[PDB]
Amino acid sequence: GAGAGAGMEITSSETGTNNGYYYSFWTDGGGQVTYTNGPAGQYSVEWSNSGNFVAGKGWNPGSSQTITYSGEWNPNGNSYLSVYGWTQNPLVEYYIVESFSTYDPSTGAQELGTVETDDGTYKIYQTTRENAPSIEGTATFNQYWSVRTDHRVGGTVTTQNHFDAWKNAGLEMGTHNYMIVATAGYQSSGSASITVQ
Ligand SMILES: O[C@@H]1[C@@H](O)[C@H](O[C@@H]2CO[C@@H](O)[C@H](O)[C@H]2O)OC[C@H]1O
Numbered sequence: 300g301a302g303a304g305a306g307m308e309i310t311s312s313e314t315g316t317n318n319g320y321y322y323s324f325w326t327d328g329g330g331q332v333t334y335t336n337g338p339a340g341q342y343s344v345e346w347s348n349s350g351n352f353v354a355g356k357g358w359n360p361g362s363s364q365t366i367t368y369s370g371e372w373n374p375n376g377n378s379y380l381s382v383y384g385w386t387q388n389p390l391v392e393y394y395i396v397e398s399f400s401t402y403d404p405s406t407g408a409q410e411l412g413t414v415e416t417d418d419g420t421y422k423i424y425q426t427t428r429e430n431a432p433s434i435e436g437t438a439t440f441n442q443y444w445s446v447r448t449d450h451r452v453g454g455t456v457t458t459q460n461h462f463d464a465w466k467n468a469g470l471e472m473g474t475h476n477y478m479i480v481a482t483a484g485y486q487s488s489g490s491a492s493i494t495v496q
């Protein structure tokens with residue numbers, strides 16, 4: 300990753316702004332999850348027998364920008380590399396899944412259609428989270444998925460094409476809160492080093 304350039308190791312949930320990028324590090328506290336901020340839009344995460352975690356850099360609020368990201372994602376088990384964010388009013392968690400490893404996180408949903416963007420095809424899903432952690436505390440909220448059929452690490456995400464496809468499928472979005480290039484994991488180990496450009 301950033302080698303000597305990695306910032307102080309973070310092992311418990313926190314947010315901030317580092318080198319002009321918003322960063323969110325959330326963990327339920329299972330296993331060992333270690334996050335570091337690098338120069339510019341870089342972050343690194345290393346995990347071992349984790350619980351649930353979601354971490355990365357981007358913007359707060361998000362403004363539907365075209366994202367470019369680079370780097371490496373090396374899971375050993377259940378992990379997702381995604382454009383990840385929240386809307387408020389209504390409260391929505393959303394995922395533009397670039398790669399998943401051993402578990403399709405769209406599992407438990409009727410497919411609502413497809414969007415073709417950034418040289419790939421994404422399947423669209425909606426689910427519900429009940430009494431779940433959120434940017435508002437314990438809450439019930441809609442989850443929207445765009446899941447790339449040809450997994451990749453890096454490239455361009457035109458977030459507005461996803462938002463448009465979701466609105467077209469009848470999925471309402473609120474006021475944008477954060478939007479990051481996230482590494483997520485559950486009951487797994489791995490490492491990732493991702494640069495948001
Ligand atoms: O302290 C609270 C954080 O724990 C909360 O973090 C969210 C929890 O739900 C996860 O799905 C999200 O990824 C994470 O951002 O945000 C609100 C804060 O007060």
Ligand SMILES: [Zn+2]
Nearest residue numbers: 398399400450
């Ligand atoms: Zn895959």
Ligand SMILES: [Zn+2]
Nearest residue numbers: 448449450451
């Ligand atoms: Zn491919």
